[PDB]
Amino acid sequence: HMASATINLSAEKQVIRGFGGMNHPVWISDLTPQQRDTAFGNGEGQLGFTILRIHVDENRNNWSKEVATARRAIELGAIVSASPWNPPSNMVETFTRNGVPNQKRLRYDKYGDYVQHLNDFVAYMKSNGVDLYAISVQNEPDYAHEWTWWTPQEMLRFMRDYAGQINCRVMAPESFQYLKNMSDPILNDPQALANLDILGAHFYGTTVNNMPYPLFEQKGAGKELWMTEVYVPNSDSNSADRWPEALEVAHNMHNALVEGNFQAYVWWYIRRSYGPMKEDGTISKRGYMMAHYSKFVRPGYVRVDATKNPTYNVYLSACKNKKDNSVVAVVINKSTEAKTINISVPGTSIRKWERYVTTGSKNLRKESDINASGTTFQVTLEPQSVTTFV
């Protein structure tokens, strides 16, 4: 039997900003020179990442450790965003939170000093050849057992009365789970919303039903939407090549893009035993899942409407290159059976797709071209696979 899907090139959705991951040379080892190239180049055997995330150290004597990786990322065409975990210690005080004592927050009398600390980091990185794309108010203000807590109202006061002085695009609030209570106050206050440039969110435990954001569709004109940190489905030691488990990475990216309208998807540590690049410097199954998007859906491409679930266990997304109206379709098949789909692309002059396939036994393998019959491309997806058509 034969399933169907339609890609509508005239129904444009979000512009793609890019894909990438975290570097943190204070908590773990920096990327090496060769690993910087594997991450940020887009040749064969490279990931094609176009976003680097870094941390803003509370101790300025550590800032120089960021520079070499961030410079090489930019030279290879990536953008850089930075997130703080704590303010300098002289700006912090303690409080008791839900009966747990000794918890950290920014002193209310130090909000202006904290603006200056962020600006000092921006200017230091600029002096060193790293013009940051954006800087965040706080990493996970709502999951801060091990760092600095901010309530929705503390975040709001900072966004409204201080964030306009930051000499960079401002990212907020980076909830651990995209909890809307952290961001609704910013969207609902005209001055706080003016001082926002990127709505940042993490995805830990975020379900599909919680990926849409009606208030952001209503009030978010001119603001970018980025998923700035996750790992999925777990951080188990030495898990990065497990199959078919790695398919959950692809699915979570599909869901960010299509269910959440996200413009960016950013992993936690780039190099790690559960990450996209293994400790031996080679790409993991989880990394190939990312690569099906990152190598092909380049910054400035625009997502378009496409049948998202054409048959059980099959998931489709499509993005268009506005330079020539060509399309990139990424199709996941979680079934133990092969699936054949007629994909209609009305109004296209394109008549041939190339395809790259990942299964448990091959990585980004170039398979036989698809020749269209008129504007319909009939494709067959191997069981337990991801295919990118270009």
């Binding site: 999951y143 091990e146 651990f176 435990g205």
Partner: peptide
């Protein structure tokens, strides 16, 4: 749940 995470980073723990």
């Amino acid at each position: 749940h995470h980073h723990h």
